[PDB]
Amino acid sequence: NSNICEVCNKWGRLFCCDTCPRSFHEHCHIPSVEANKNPWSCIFCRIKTIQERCPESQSGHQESEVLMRQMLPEEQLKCEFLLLKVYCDSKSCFFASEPYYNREGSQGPQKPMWLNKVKTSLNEQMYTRVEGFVQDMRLIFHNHKEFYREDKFTRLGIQVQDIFEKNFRNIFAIQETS
Ligand SMILES: [Zn+2]
């Protein structure tokens, strides 16, 4: 097993996966690492098993169809993993916790949004369809672009959105296009 957390790359109190070498802090894993369960398989392993059970699930899909899917267990898992893939990037620190807005020449967004809120919303089964989760994720970066205007800090939103989008296309097997 690895000696650092797969998500935040720090050591500490780690839980080790039984079917791959990854390790996690308790609340870095999504869902939070489960109390008992021996053996325990991490989210990377669980996502791999889905693909292996249904190889055809990797054929291309239309985003419109993906977004309308109900949040049954497999889609819940895939959103959890996509969220985890965003937290894996260190630049997600900017978007994790509840923002506040007081900048000359800018007004705060009408609907603030942040990663820990999406995390809670997933944990509490508040999204009925994939679209709900994706909309809140995209709102995080859209709010940031709008607020920071021409400050070069806007680029952090572009960068972390790019990570989200690449992973969304990968996890949900979106049809590749030019
Ligand atoms: Zn961690």
Ligand SMILES: [Zn+2]
């Ligand atoms: Zn694993």
Ligand SMILES: [Zn+2]
């Ligand atoms: Zn099959």
